[PDB]
Symmetry: D2
């Protein structure tokens, strides 16, 4: 298969542009020119590109320099037809952000963090971005007594309400997506899982403008089921964006190509997103790859890895489709009663009074006979994997 613009595959400038300087060594690749990155991505089938302010315009560029970069950038976008669906701000690299951006203990840092973001929202709005992703990588602590969490949540909320206000007043029409991460670079990061971020979002002044940007490896860093948390984000209707990559359980963030980590969870994730209710996908935003080409590769490996993300997604999609169109799979689904969960537990108009009145729900319930019937889950799982394996 081949990717179409309708597939909505996007990449961060910082993914294919990662120079591969890790915590233990020097960069192994030279820097990637943004215009060149735009052209190469267009060529492999991406529909959009995203970036942190500091990825495009070097921190501290004078206004003439910044303007020049932006103009050349826009020309590339123009010529290739690529769009900018989301933009983000780097609030983690500069030493000033060592204790966080919006939640640094230092008040002045909190004021500067908000200004850095407002400036990025202007540029995002001018490039046509619809989503602002917020990754508080430095909001957290290494020691419990160093950070008042409650105060931190108050400050977090205080910054986000201002941003929504500015956006709404300027008519930018942006949606905000908080991206959870459990740890790294802080010992413990605030809003550690998709769940924590969703619960926080619900407390903002204008919750409807806020959702989450969950990343495959981030949830896997806590050994949580990514597809299942995505299912819950979809139930809340807070899946505003998604970051796809690979990870091997709890360890530093690996940022492997999507599907190269937990293959079976990648498979069930693609099934969830594309085989939504009513034939159609359950999610329609970008399919964004927030990964890193391995430190062992050169620029050839970089493009190979960019293309592997898309191939992985399309192969899994193909297998998820065949899975569902298989009359044997359908028969197994029926035997396992998956769909029966979709039927209300109470009858139409039944309340507690009528339930209490139904002796078949208790008094005459044969728990023991029901308890002995098998659900056929293993067999269902086996057919799923045989589809993934191309054995069916």
């Amino acid at each position: 298969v081949q990717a179409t613009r309708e597939d909505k595959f996007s990449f961060g400038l910082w993914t294919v542009g990662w120079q591969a300087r890790d915590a233990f060594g020097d960069a192994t690749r030279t820097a990637l020119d943004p215009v060149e990155a735009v052209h190469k991505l267009a060529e492999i089938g991406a529909y959009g590109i995203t970036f942190h302010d500091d990825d495009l315009v070097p921190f501290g560029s004078d206004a003439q320099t910044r303007d020049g970069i932006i103009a050349g950038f826009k020309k590339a976008l123009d010529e290739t037809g690529l769009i900018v669906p989301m933009v983000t701000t780097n609030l983690f690299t500069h030493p000033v952000f060592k204790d966080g951006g919006f939640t640094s203990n230092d008040r002045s840092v909190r004021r500067y963090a908000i200004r850095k973001v407002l400036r990025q929202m202007d540029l995002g709005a001018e490039l046509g971005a619809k989503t602002l992703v917020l990754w508080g990588g430095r909001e957290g602590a290494e020691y419990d007594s160093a950070k008042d969490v409650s105060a931190a949540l108050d400050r977090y909320r205080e910054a986000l309400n201002l941003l929504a206000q500015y956006s709404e007043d300027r008519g930018y029409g942006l949606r905000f997506a908080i991206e959870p991460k459990p740890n790294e670079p802080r010992g413990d990061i605030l809003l550690p899982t998709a769940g924590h971020a969703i619960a926080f979002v619900q407390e903002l002044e204008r919750p409807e403008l806020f959702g989450i940007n969950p990343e495959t490896g981030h949830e896997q860093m806590s050994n949580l089921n990514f597809t299942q948390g995505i299912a819950q984000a979809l139930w809340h209707k807070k899946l505003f964006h998604i970051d796809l990559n690979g990870q091997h359980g709890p360890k530093f963030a690996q940022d492997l190509v999507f599907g190269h980590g937990d293959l079976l969870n990648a498979f069930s994730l693609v099934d969830l997103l594309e085989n939504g209710p009513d034939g159609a996908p359950a999610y329609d935003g970008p399919r964004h790859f927030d990964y890193k080409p391995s430190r062992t590769e050169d620029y050839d490996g970089v493009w190979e890895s960019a293309k592997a993300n898309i191939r992985m997604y399309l192969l899994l999609k193909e297998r998820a489709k065949a899975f569902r169109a298989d009359p044997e799979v359908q028969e197994a689904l029926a035997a396992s009663k998956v769909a029966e969960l979709k039927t209300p537990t109470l009858n139409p108009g039944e309340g507690y009074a009528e339930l209490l009145a139904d002796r078949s729900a208790f008094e005459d319930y044969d728990a023991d006979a029901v308890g002995a019937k098998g659900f056929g889950f293993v067999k269902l799982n086996q057919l799923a994997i045989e589809h993934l394996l191309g054995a069916r």
Copy 2:
């Protein structure tokens, strides 16, 4: 120290009553008589006792027997002065619940599960319990294609809405506390963390009636920071109850005595609950121990372990207070700017307009000079620990 009824130490009947049949071996202790449990707990300092329907009255007891057990149980409470602060229902042991109670694929099981809880609500209301704890230990899956998470959340919501309705109509005045757990016994449990559980509760019909009951070991099974999650729960005002125990990271649930797992986090937790604002505790509910006396122990080890839970809490309490009262700590807190996080980022009346006008927050901000100053967090952490070791 010594426990008083104002400490509000409570224990589940299933804790000290655990016979020690694990996944790999037979019970090493005989059954504990509930009346005796009441007496023994009263003696060590507990102010209350809790239980699952099935802990007190054997599954499938005739009306006569059930009635008989309750009446003796009420007498023991009477005689001893212990209260029943919370009650819970067993929706995990019987084979009928193998796929869950409220979210079983099987509709007849969901109906039966609701019935079983209504009944315990009645008994709870009758014994004076204020909280209904809901632990969905069988809600989840081993295989992704076997459970429609969205439909399961619908069914979970549907069942809770009804319980609230009933309680309000009967005038029981119960609060409901959902208890999250990431896995075990299901491969993946629905509402895996305190975060996911708060997000969910917010979607119910009468959200003001629902909160969570987080357990130390559950969050640690995912390697999350328990104290930090409780601080978030308190920020949301959803800390309806708490289960205290010990765990050594991502592994099977150990249920050790509180403070026998992650000692540093047990210290910071006690500090957060007790050294609340306005001198007073940030949390006023029961300090409930949901732990298990090790399988290597006899009834003496059982009472020894019960007392250890109390002693650990009180020794930590004593050190958390000394910590906060130390002038050197006060000096370290100041240098760390812990309290500066409580001052709003914006001056009263400032909005984005005024922030944008402040050159000092961006254009004239010296990020480099600010980034060079240390926060003194290591020194502050070292002082906390020396207080914990009784070295200061």
Copy 3:
């Protein structure tokens, strides 16, 4: 695909016979008759069966009963053509073993544990078993001060040395396989990984009679790479047996069907065992499945799951074979220099002096130029997954 006796698939009687009594609930299935298990396994394609003494003869059976049971079992093997490649002893279920068998702090328990094993060695030898597997599930601790590890290792050794003495003297010709596990049921188990078990065995009296029996899920419980661990065991020539199953990282032991956990690792594993040096497998023993049919299944689900194991292994083999046979893979392997690791670093007869005199190895070496060439690893990896997916 179809299983042959040459595939050497074996199953423990305790696998398909698991009644599904976990730590949180009662059994969901009835007991399986050993004779019936023998007929069913023979039928699905297994070549052998294994058992714990207590799986076949109920703990405490008189010799009359014991003898009768062995006779019937023996007939079933007879009629079916199944062999007993390995036997093991249950040193974890009975309460007496709450602190271990061989390493219990109680001296009498230690004497008893040895006797229990000698007896099982006798039955093993009578049935033609070649391997005695030792899983020290209760050897370890929940608390650091409770167990002197050094003393424990001395006692583990003392017991094993006696066992080898006896087998050698009785001429049984058995091989001993130590099975490592990090935790569960003890907080921490002695000899937690394949590495620790191999190091320990090297200290026995007759080390050549000892090896390890690593289990997929056991290594994965610590988030280790099972394939890489097996590779090391093979390098040492200590892979005496292997237990195959599935797990999803650090959590309770799941015992899923082989390949239903880390699917990518399941693939590299079959490749390692099967595409050994010169076409031939790198491993020759039994391909033993030590898994459990999920608690949600009935006997139908049980047989299904038994066959899924065989199915998974044969589908994987088939793709591992195709992977290696692919000229494009062959080309990618060359570009990544995988085979160049086989060439000695040193020239023939070259020592320190010749190497120190070689200017090209240091003084005149261009590290920067070599540091920039890519290894093409992502591309090789993508080729492997495409073969797994049946897309190549």
Copy 4:
């Protein structure tokens, strides 16, 4: 309590000198001068300093320069009375080492890797170092098909055999300590745990010359019991060196001050190393701190964190001593039968024939009765924790 040269506290140049440039941000501290480091460490009580070649002499310094630095360094040593107990080689930072040093797929890098170490050996020899630590941080892989584990071990062995040859011919008297780590920077590193490294070492040409250098945090990254692995290392007599620091379970390596991660395990570890065999320490080498001052700290924080390491050790030592001297602890130890484990299971001159003849070890053994007695382990654990908290 104050540090003495007898305490043998040592620090790597790279610990206090870490500029806090992490995987997500720029350096927050300026470079530390080596002469300065020697002077500051001498002042806080360190008896020795260690370094990688590249920490002292910048990669690629001409001889004049290198020679100059060493002379200055030696002078500082001289003046302060500090020794160099161990030296190591940086085989991980430079891009040439991206796939490993000794086990890189590239033959030329392997050759260069050996030359770089020989050179460091000469310098170590020159400064009087006794141990060569080898941390194979880049040895491993991100993908299973990229690395032939078997060939890698052959090449790891080939290189070490040569180093020992050279040391021995030259009369250097060095001991070699392999340092295990499960992951980071590589997806999976070869020789991941203490166990894997000990097993490997037993296979070299002069094994007596090889041991391990386990690091607290590295074992904890896999959720292993650090104290328990050290106990096994001591049993094998392979604990040649130790790296002390703190970690919070499986996540990126935190490098916290010793005792700031798992405090209970830090306590059991000091007890193990100090309350050795006679009354004397069980370990006689350097107590080396391989940690990193948190990125949030300035140079005042750096010196505070250095001192914290020594203070945690001395405070734990003091409580470990008190624990063992307590009569109540003695009594708990007696009730738990800790010392009974040190008595041979067999009576002197007893073999399998005598054991088989002992009816009391089996035929007349009352397992039910023994299984009912408790070990009193919780109580023993409780007294240990109370000693730790200075509560007794």
